Structures are given as C-alpha cells and as structure tokens.
Design a protein around this ligand. Structure first.
Ligand code: UDP
Ligand code: GAL
Ligand code: MN
Length: 286
C-alpha cells in the first residue's frame, strides 16, 4: 500500500514542451530511457522513501581487482542512493583485502567469500551463478543493482533507475545500427541474435531490477551459459552476450542512458551527456 505524497512545489510539466528533444526518452515498449532532464528527483525520492526502499549493490572483486574497491565504495557513498537504505554485497576471494570504508547512516556492507577462477572470462561469467545468494537477497533488499568494480561514481545515481528490470546502454554502441552490435552471431550459442533483431546493445557492467527479476535474469543467463559450455561454445562477450539475449526476449522496464556507464578516456564528454555518473577507471587489460 502506498501512502499519499505530501504537498510539493515544483515546476509544472508542460505536455507541449519535451524535457529532451535530442534523444529518445521512451522505448517502443513504453519503458523510460533515463537521461538527465527527464526526471524530478525530488518526486522520485519521496515516492521511494515512502516505501522505505532498500537497494542492494553487488560487486565482485576477485584477484587483483580488490585494488578497485576503495575508490568504488568511497564514491558510491558520495553518489549512490544517498538518503536511502543501501546494502553492499562485496564478493571476493580475499576478504582481508576489502578496505575499511566509512559508511553513511542506513548503509551496510557484507563481505561474501567466493572462489577465484583462473580465467578472466570465468570470473566474469560466474557472477550470474553467484548472484542467483537467492534467499538472502529476498529477505534483505527490495532491488538489486549489479555492477563492475573497476569504476567510480562521479555524479548522482539514484532511485530514478529503480524498476522491475533494467539494462544500461553500452557507451560504444548507443549511436550504432543493430547490425553493428557485437551480439553473439553463431546459431550454435544460446546467446545467438540474428542481424535483423535487437533493440539495444546493453553492457554487462550495470543491470538490475527487483530481486525477483534479477534472480530470473541471472538464473536464465547461468543456465544458458551452462548449455553453451556443454556444447563447447563460449559466447563472444561472455555474460554480456547472454544478458543481451535475455533483454531482447524480456524487455526491460527502464533503460539507463550512457550517463550511467561511460569511459571519458576512450569517448570524451559529448554534449548529449549532461552528466557523467558512473565511469571506467583506467586499467591495463592485460
Ligand atoms: O580478475 C578479475 C576479472 C574480473 N573481475 C570482476 O569482473 C568484472 C568484469 O571484468 P572487467 O571489468 O575486467 O571487464 P571489462 O569492463 O574490462 O570488459 C570486473 O569489474 C570485476 O568485478 C574480477 O573481479 N577479477
Ligand atoms: O563489444 C563489446 C565490448 O566492448 C568493449 O568496449 C568492452 O570493453 C567489452 O567489455 C565489451 O562490452
Ligand atoms: Mn569493467
């Protein structure tokens, strides 16, 4: 049950004036595409605080990537769901290497030890299995957000992203035609998408939704990756190829713009991005 919003004073939306004329702000299945200037964060904050919303954030920091946790977490504290209840879940093979970061009130961090895999690809790929922790998340949070660690928050990332299921536009492909997307193109893979299908190319580094929908998504991608393994095939972009196949067949209820996943070193700061909110930290491949 949702109680009434209080009286609020804010600018009137006018239907004969668009917030943004330069970009697509709604998908053809009527999911908002979240750009700056499309949302009044004061109204959204009210709606979500009146539900005492709790957001979980998953992050894997395996092997060398524990080095990225300090900046990731400290900048999350400045910009990620400030004012709301947050539970970080840090999955790592080195619990002792997790930095001691000071958290704002209403925020908590759990360290979950997991195995390390040798291959970069398996570390990245086995996140879906590890995420799909099912019973704990259902008891502890309302939404789950699943991100890469080799990142920093530079600006607001808040409850405008929350919805039953979201993906984020990959910053290399938002202006591309579908045939240029790097979907898995071999029909022998479960992640296969033909050249005439596809709405968007979503990046594997930022997706989320309600616990139920995120558990559906990660269970389906883990099952599909097991089928591929049994068939001796590995999708071209690993878990990201399977996330794309899932989101083509189960449309997300919001899509985040590339404000939410950017690389300023490789792509600069185009005018179409009013804010750069969550960005890659430089790293050697290797
Ligand atoms: O040795 C590794 C390799 C990958 N990852 C995790 O897998 C994610 C995706 O890998 P990566 O960031 O290397 O992929 P990229 O963004 O460079 O394509 C990383 O952010 C980490 O969360 C990790 O923890 N240790
Ligand atoms: O083509 C898709 C690829 O694009 C790269 O820019 C990115 O580093 C990879 O992780 C993958 O998303
Ligand atoms: Mn990454």
């Amino acid at each position: 049950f949702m109680v009434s919003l209080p009286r609020m004073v804010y600018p009137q939306p006018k239907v004969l004036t668009p917030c943004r004329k330069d970009v697509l702000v709604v998908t053809p299945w009527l999911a908002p595409i979240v750009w700056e200037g499309t949302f009044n964060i004061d109204i959204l904050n009210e709606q979500f605080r009146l539900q005492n919303t709790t957001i979980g954030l998953t992050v894997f920091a395996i092997k060398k990537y524990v080095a990225f946790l300090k900046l990731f977490l400290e900048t999350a504290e400045k910009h990620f769901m400030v004012g709301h209840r947050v539970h970080y879940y840090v999955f790592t093979d080195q619990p002792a290497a997790v930095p001691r970061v000071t958290l704002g009130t209403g925020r908590q961090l759990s360290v979950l030890e997991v195995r390390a895999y040798k291959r970069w690809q398996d570390v990245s790929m086995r996140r879906m299995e590890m995420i799909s922790c099912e019973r704990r998340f259902l008891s502890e949070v309302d939404y789950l957000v699943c991100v890469d660690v080799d990142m920093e928050f530079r600006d607001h990332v808040g409850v405008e992203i929350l919805t039953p299921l979201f993906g984020t536009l990959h910053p290399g492909f938002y202006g591309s035609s579908r045939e240029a997307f790097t979907y898995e193109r071999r029909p022998q893979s479960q992640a296969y998408i033909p050249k005439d299908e596809g709405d968007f190319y979503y990046m594997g580094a930022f997706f989320g939704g309600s616990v139920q929908e995120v558990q559906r998504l990660t269970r389906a991608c883990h099952q599909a990756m097991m089928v591929d393994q049994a068939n001796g095939i590995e999708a071209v972009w690993h878990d990201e190829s399977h996330l794309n196949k899932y989101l083509l067949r189960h449309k997300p209820t919001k899509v985040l713009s590339p404000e939410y996943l950017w690389d300023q070193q490789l792509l600069g700061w185009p005018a179409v991005l009013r804010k750069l909110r969550f960005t890659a930290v430089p790293k050697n491949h290797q």
